[PDB]
Design a protein around this ligand. Structure first.
Ligand SMILES: Nc1nc2c(ncn2[C@@H]2O[C@H](COP(=O)(O)OP(=O)(O)OP(=O)(O)O)[C@@H](O)[C@H]2O)c(=O)[nH]1
Ligand SMILES: Nc1ncnc2c1ncn2[C@@H]1O[C@H](COP(=O)(O)OP(=O)(O)CP(=O)(O)O)[C@@H](O)[C@H]1O
Ligand SMILES: COc1ccc2c(c1N)C(=O)O[C@@H]2[C@H]1c2c(cc3c(c2OC)OCO3)CCN1C
Ligand SMILES: Nc1nc2c(ncn2[C@@H]2O[C@H](COP(=O)(O)OP(=O)(O)O)[C@@H](O)[C@H]2O)c(=O)[nH]1
Ligand SMILES: [Ca+2]
Ligand SMILES: [Mg+2]
Ligand SMILES: [Mg+2]
Ligand SMILES: [Mg+2]
Lengths: 333, 439, 53, 422
């Protein structure tokens, strides 16, 4: 009999993983504070990695990689890409870290060069509360975060002339195999993209929460402003005479592999007294040239409603039962 | 030449001391009768090995050691063992009934009745030293004597020998290796009372030694002998600089100077490689790069923890065997490009290296195989604070219910000392966080 | 990658390599011990008083 | 590390006799006190229970007490009767008539000084007295009433020594008189205050084991005592033989008793007694099974505060750890989580006679409250009508003392339930 504990009741993904573990009849849930567990579904903040792997006779597995925050924090992601020789980088937007070390002078230097050069000088500021503007003075006065080139030429879906972003779910097991769930989702803006009104942040912000609130034609084109790959692939074939795999997925797979392999030596649990795995949420942008851009990585992502069953089952088979056998939906990168 | 006095307290300290002095004698060519043929200065001398051994007119080389235990069964094995001739009776001190795993019993009740005797037996060794550096103190955290009496002795040593340095070799409790239930209590209580009196303490987690013995020596159920012989190899690597000609860590003061920038954070992490089974028929000898790389593997550390998620304040590389500076720098450079080695901002990103040409010595018939080169790394990492967090948490679980507290109060200890000690550990944990963590 | 303070002898050598620049008194102890003894004495006197009753 | 053994009353002396028979055999001591063993492990800690006389004779450090001579004449005529020190037989002629008041206040008071004289003489010849162990029943008069009077007087003279008892709890299934709940409740009051460790041996459990497990349709006291001596030998192995850890009565108490009043242990033993040796998994499963507990309490009805487990015989110590870790790791709900690593395991190479390996269980469980609840109910059923009280008021006791003992035992029950919900 395998044992596990739950320390993040607010996790929708692992509430289903927890549920599935019981249905197998070979997993028993323990109290959140019992140290004699094989599997820990830990909390988001201050997970006590230091107490894992010291219980004799217990092989212990946790669902978070210590140190993966480097990738899943907007500020630290920018620093990681800049200072990592394996990243240096053509798929991450020009970003700068600005405190309210700091890169103010370096940011304005490039900003001025673009201004005189006639090039589009629209940037976006965000933190871990979003401001989009083409005036540097307005961006900095709002911070008093990370400033990042706002992709002015995004690929717009038709009909609707609307924006979108792509969410990919990636599972990394204790062996540091990288598994890409073959089912993604597009978060679609239901408002036509207006490149002359950055003040209204509804046709510019892709978040499902913003579309469900401020968007008044929400859910017009797709259910819940979520388009899945089968539909998106067919659209690319009909409209652009290409496939999702060729035009976008190759780049997504490359970006995923570059980020995770870069930080592998720092977080791998290969020769550690406990083992780790983690589900990541990669968010990408696509421009009109069919170039994929990485936007951010989420370390505690939620899943699409119609994808919880399949993915969560995939977590047990690949990430858990691989360490605790009982009595593919992923693409291995 | 300046002398060092070793002090072994409780069962763990005594049996580990037995392993160390057995190994010292093998390394210096000293026979169990105390004779040393290679020593041509009969009845005297100020050679490097004289910092640990005095000499009698009859040519016997006597350890500068004191063995103290509150019950006699463990020290009685020294008196009748293979090295019975080495020590004279004054050095071996035993009571009649132990501290029953009770810090308060060893510190207050029984400690008060034997502390003056121990100090006087120590004073008699000091009186034989032209220039005493300080003391090396071996003990367990979890034992009633190792915890409770050691903390008392350390206080009085600071009073009687103020200018002298004191180093600790402390055995951290692990349930795999015969622990008492109250050992977290004793660990926090003794760390709190000893903190201001120790200049540098080397913690050895029995869990780590246990797993190295299972994994590398292929011993299913490691015994204390297996554990102590491995521990003595690490201890010998740490003290070799005091016993042999050299230029690195030549006196006890140098340990604090090189490994401890801030006094409270005086717990360097020790990593040792290679540990090879003597029963292993065919074995391929590891290189300088390979043993140096192994120093950054958690599986080889004396305390299990992840240095990748801490910051370094100092790192010392102590090689024994066929090693030349050229090969060390080559290995270091490579490891820099592959390993996560983050130093604190206010410290140089560097390594103090020491090489002794004599390869490690192994007890004949032991579990360790002779190797051509070995290395012990001493690095002051904030990662070692993980061991404090684990320990403090176990303390919190029991103390919230006051479980077993009445045993300590019954020996004259006030309940306040529990919270006082715990508060000190909380401050210690916070000091590590301030030093090595980013917001 | 600088090497400094190289010291060589017949039994080995040491050096430093840089990869990147940057108490209670005896009286107080005796009181502590005697204070604990008195508390043990008081507790035993209570036990003996309780047993005498 | 000398222990002084005291056995009082009928039950105490019959169980005590068997104990000395069993461990004398394990240590190679014959009925005449001569050692004829073949292993140095038998003599390494022989002094814990035996003295040395001229001619390499070993004499148990045992004091035999009773208020009537009958049962102690039997001991002196038993197999090992000649091994006991003749001066250590201390007996009267009146008996206690299954009456706690007589053992504790009238008949026993007359004899207690003589016992303390023998205890004093045994203690004075001890290099470092470890503590005392007493065998007695709680349902009679001498072991219960005088036995606890002895404990009170030993504590007064040796306040810093450990007091350990093997206490046989009465049961209607194996009853002699109806006043056993009175005698037991009065005794538990004493034990709660004046012992450091008490092995609760429930005669209801001993009967059930003989009837249900051993298939003995008509169990006798001899059959019940076979289980007690095997248990006593088990829970004293760690005191009698060399081990990796040197353990004595005080280290046992420190690790088993997290709160002073909760020092009542459930003992267990496997295998219950065949030529087929058990596997380590079988020993481990049986030693934790309710049917192997010597106290008729359901462990699943409470939680373990601490556990000690002793394995005897030549077995895989690796496999022992794997199975012991298996029990805790798969039944974590019955172990309090606020005492880390509260299950300690020990191994002894020397097995008990007639077995190639065995396991002895010592549990400090909150389920033991069921034992005191049972006694409390039987006590109250009679006390509410003052039934049979005249046997006690006739010896100088008044009802208030019965009310106090009942209240104190009900408090003990509330304490166990308090930590069962921690
Ligand atoms: N590595 C190692 N650990 C030991 C040894 N002996 C005891 N220990 C550990 O020390 C702790 C118990 O402390 P002890 O040294 O045995 O107790 P003590 O200092 O003699 O004090 P007392 O309670 O009076 O017996 C446990 O955690 C044991 O695992 C040993 O020889 N080697
Ligand atoms: N450089 C850029 N160019 C174009 N659009 C951008 C952009 N940076 C951010 N956005 C838009 O802002 C939205 C949210 O930015 P952000 O990185 O903060 O996601 P978020 O963290 O607020 C919610 P989520 O966890 O789902 O990504 C994205 O969905 C995207 O549409
Ligand atoms: C709850 O955990 C524990 C329980 C018991 C012990 C410890 C411990 N940590 C512990 O360290 O000392 C004791 C001691 C012991 C054991 C069993 C015995 C016994 C003991 O002592 C004389 O006498 C009767 O059967 C088992 C372990 N052993 C070393
Ligand atoms: N297990 C066991 N119980 C006994 C034995 N003799 C008596 N008893 C029990 O002890 C109680 C009677 O006490 P007893 O020892 O005979 O009276 P005492 O001589 O005054 O101490 C009853 O509960 C009996 O069931 C015995 O040999 N073995
Ligand atoms: Ca000389
Ligand atoms: Mg995000
Ligand atoms: Mg000891
Ligand atoms: Mg009777």
């Amino acid at each position: 009999m395998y044992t596990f504990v739950v320390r993040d009741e607010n996790s929708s993904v692992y509430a289903e993983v927890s549920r599935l573990l019981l249905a197998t009849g070979q997993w028993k849930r323990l109290r959140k504070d019992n140290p004699r567990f094989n599997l820990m579904l830990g909390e988001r903040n201050r997970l006590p990695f230091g107490r894992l792997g010291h219980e004799p006779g217990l092989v212990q597995l946790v669902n978070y990689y210590r140190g993966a925050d480097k990738l899943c924090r907007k500020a630290s992601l920018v620093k990681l890409i800049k200072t990592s020789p394996e990243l240096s980088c053509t798929w991450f937007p020009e970003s700068y870290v600005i405190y309210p070390t700091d890169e103010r002078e370096v940011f304005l230097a490039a900003y001025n060069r673009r201004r005189e050069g006639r090039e589009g000088n629209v940037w976006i500021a965000k933190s871990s509360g979003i401001l989009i503007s083409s005036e540097a003075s307005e961006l900095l006065d709002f911070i008093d975060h990370v400033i990042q080139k706002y992709l002015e030429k995004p690929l717009l879906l038709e009909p609707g002339h609307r924006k979108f972003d792509i969410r990919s779910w990636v599972l990394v097991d204790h062996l540091y195999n990288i598994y890409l769930y073959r089912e993604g989702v597009l978060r679609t803006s239901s408002e036509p993209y207006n490149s002359a009104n950055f003040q209204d942040k509804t046709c510019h912000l892709t978040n499902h929460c913003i579309q469900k609130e401020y968007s008044k034609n929400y859910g017009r084109y797709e259910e819940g402003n979520e388009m899945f790959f089968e539909e998106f692939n067919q659209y690319l074939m009909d409209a652009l005479n290409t496939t999702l795999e060729n035009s976008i997925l190759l780049q997504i797979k490359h970006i995923i592999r570059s980020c995770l392999m870069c930080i592998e030596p720092a977080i791998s649990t290969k020769h550690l007294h406990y083992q780790s795995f983690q589900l990541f949420g990669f968010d990408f942008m696509v421009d009109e040239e069919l170039k994929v851009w990485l936007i951010e990585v989420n370390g505690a992502p939620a899943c699409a409603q119609k994808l919880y069953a399949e993915l969560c089952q995939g977590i047990v088979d690949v990430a858990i039962s691989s360490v605790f056998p009982l009595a593919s939906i992923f693409i291995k990168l | 030449m300046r002398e060092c006095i070793s002090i072994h307290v409780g069962q763990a300290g005594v049996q580990i001391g037995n392993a160390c002095w057995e190994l010292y004698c093998l390394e210096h060519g000293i026979q169990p009768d105390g004779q040393m043929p290679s020593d041509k200065t009969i009845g005297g001398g100020d050679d490097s090995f004289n910092t640990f051994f005095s000499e009698t007119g009859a040519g016997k080389h006597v350890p500068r050691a004191v063995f103290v235990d509150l019950e006699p069964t463990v020290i009685d094995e020294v008196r009748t063992g293979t090295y019975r001739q080495l020590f004279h009776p004054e050095q071996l001190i035993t009571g009649k009934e132990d501290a029953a795993n009770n810090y308060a019993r060893g510190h207050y009740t029984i400690g008060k009745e034997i502390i003056d005797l121990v100090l006087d037996r120590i004073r008699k060794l000091a009186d034989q030293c032209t220039g005493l550096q300080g003391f090396l103190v071996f003990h367990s955290f979890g034992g009633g004597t190792g915890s409770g009496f050691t903390s008392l002795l350390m206080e009085r040593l600071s009073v009687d020998y103020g200018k002298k340095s004191k180093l600790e070799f402390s055995i951290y409790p692990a349930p795999q290796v015969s622990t008492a239930v109250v050992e977290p209590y004793n660990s926090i209580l003794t760390t709190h009372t000893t903190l201001e009196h120790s200049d540098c303490a080397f913690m050895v987690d029995n869990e780590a030694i246990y797993d190295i013995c299972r994994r590398n020596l292929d011993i299913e159920r490691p015994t204390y002998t297996n554990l102590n012989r491995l521990i003595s190899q690490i201890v010998s690597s740490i003290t070799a600089s005091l016993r042999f000609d050299g230029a690195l860590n030549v006196d006890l003061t140098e340990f604090q100077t090189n490994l401890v920038p801030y006094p409270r954070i005086h717990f360097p992490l020790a990593t040792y490689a290679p540990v090879i089974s003597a029963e292993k028929a065919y074995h391929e000898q590891l290189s300088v790069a390979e043993i140096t790389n192994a120093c950054f593997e958690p599986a080889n550390q004396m305390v299990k923890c992840d240095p990748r998620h801490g910051k370094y304040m100092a790192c010392c590389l102590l090689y024994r065997g066929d090693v030349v500076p050229k090969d060390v720098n080559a290995a270091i450079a490579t490891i820099k490009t592959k390993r996560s080695i983050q130093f604190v901002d206010w410290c140089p990103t560097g390594f103090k290296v020491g090489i002794n040409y004599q390869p490690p010595t192994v007890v004949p018939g032991g579990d360790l195989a002779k190797v051509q080169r070995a290395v012990c790394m001493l690095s002051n990492t904030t990662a070692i604070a993980e061991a404090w967090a684990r320990l403090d948490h176990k303390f919190d679980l029991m103390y919230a219910k006051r479980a077993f507290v009445h045993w300590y109060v019954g020996e004259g200890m006030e309940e306040g000392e529990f919270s006082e000690a715990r508060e000190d550990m909380a401050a210690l944990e916070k000091d590590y966080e301030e030093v090595g963590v980013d917001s | 990658m600088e090497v400094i303070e190289l010291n060589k002898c017949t039994s080995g050598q040491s050096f430093e390599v840089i990869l990147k620049p940057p108490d209670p008194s005896l009286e107080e102890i005796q009181k502590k011990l005697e204070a604990a003894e008195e508390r043990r004495k008081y507790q035993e006197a209570e036990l003996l008083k309780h047993l005498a009753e | 590390r000398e222990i002084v053994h005291i056995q009082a009353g009928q039950c105490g002396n019959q169980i005590g006799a068997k104990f000395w028979e069993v461990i004398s055999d394990e240590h190679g001591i014959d009925p005449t006190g001569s050692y004829h063993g073949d292993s140095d492990l038998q003599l390494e800690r022989i002094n814990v229970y035996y003295n040395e006389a001229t001619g390499n004779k070993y004499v148990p450090r045992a004091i035999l007490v009773d208020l009537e001579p009958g049962t102690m004449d039997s001991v002196r005529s038993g197999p090992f009767g000649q091994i006991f020190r003749p001066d250590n037989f201390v007996f009267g002629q009146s008996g206690a008539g299954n009456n706690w008041a007589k053992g504790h206040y009238t008949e026993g008071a007359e004899l207690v000084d003589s016992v303390l004289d023998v205890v004093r003489k045994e203690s004075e010849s001890c290099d470092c007295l470890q503590g005392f162990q007493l065998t007695h029943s709680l349902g009679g008069g001498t072991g219960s009433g005088m036995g606890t009077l002895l404990i009170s007087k030993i504590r007064e003279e040796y306040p810093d020594r450990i007091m350990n008892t093997f206490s046989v709890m009465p049961s209607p299934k194996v009853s002699d008189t109806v006043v056993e709940p009175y005698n037991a409740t009065l005794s538990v009051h004493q034990l709660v205050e004046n012992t450091d460790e008490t092995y609760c041996i429930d005669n209801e459990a001993l009967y059930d084991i003989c009837f249900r497990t051993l298939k003995l349709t008509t169990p006798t006291y001899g059959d019940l005592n076979h289980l007690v001596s095997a248990t006593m030998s088990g829970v004293t192995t760690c005191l009698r033989f060399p081990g990796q850890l040197n353990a004595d009565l005080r280290k046992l108490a420190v690790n088993m008793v997290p709160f002073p009043r909760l020092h009542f242990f459930m003992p267990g033993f496997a295998p219950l007694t065949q030529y087929r040796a058990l596997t380590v998994p079988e020993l481990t499963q049986q030693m934790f099974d309710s049917k192997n507990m010597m106290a008729a309490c359901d462990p699943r009805h409470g939680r373990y505060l601490t556990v000690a487990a002793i394995f005897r015989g030549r077995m895989s110590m690796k496999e022992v750890d794997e199975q012991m870790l298996n029990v805790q790791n798969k039944n974590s709900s019955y172990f309090v989580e606020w005492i880390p690593n509260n299950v300690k395991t020990a191994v002894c190479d020397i097995p008990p006679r007639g077995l190639k390996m065995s396991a002895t269980f010592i549990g400090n469980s909150t389920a033991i409250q069921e034992l005191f609840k049972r006694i409390s109910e039987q006590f109250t059923a009679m006390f509410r009508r003052k039934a049979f009280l005249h046997w006690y008021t006739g010896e100088g006791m008044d009802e208030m003392e019965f009310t106090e003992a009942e209240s104190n035992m009900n408090d003990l029950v509330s304490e166990y339930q308090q930590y069962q919900d921690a």
